[PDB]
């Protein structure tokens, strides 16, 4: 497996999963989100003001589905 680590741009949508996130600050970039199991879950979008980073691949941030199709 691998980590995404993408740092978000100003105005960029970010996605948490209300079902799987360990904390509400755990998020995925749109590419990882759309490649993840969480696209079928109760997701929550927060817009980045510039900064923050994608937690795809962080096995401590997600109760299930820590990776997306791209990073698995």
């Amino acid at each position: 497996g691998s980590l995404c680590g993408r740092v978000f741009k100003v105005g960029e949508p970010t996605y948490s999963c209300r079902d799987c996130a360990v904390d509400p600050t755990c998020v995925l970039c749109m590419e990882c989100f759309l490649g993840s199991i969480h696209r079928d879950h109760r997701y929550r979008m927060t817009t980045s003001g510039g900064g923050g980073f994608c937690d795809c691949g962080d096995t401590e941030a997600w109760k299930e589905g820590p990776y997306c199709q791209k990073h698995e």
């Binding site: 978000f8 970010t14 904390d23 600050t25 755990c26 998020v27 927060t46 980045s48 003001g49 900064g51 923050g52 980073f53 937690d55 941030a61």
Partner: peptide, 4 residues
């Protein structure tokens, strides 16, 4: 992670 992100923080508003």
């Amino acid at each position: 992670h992100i923080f508003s």
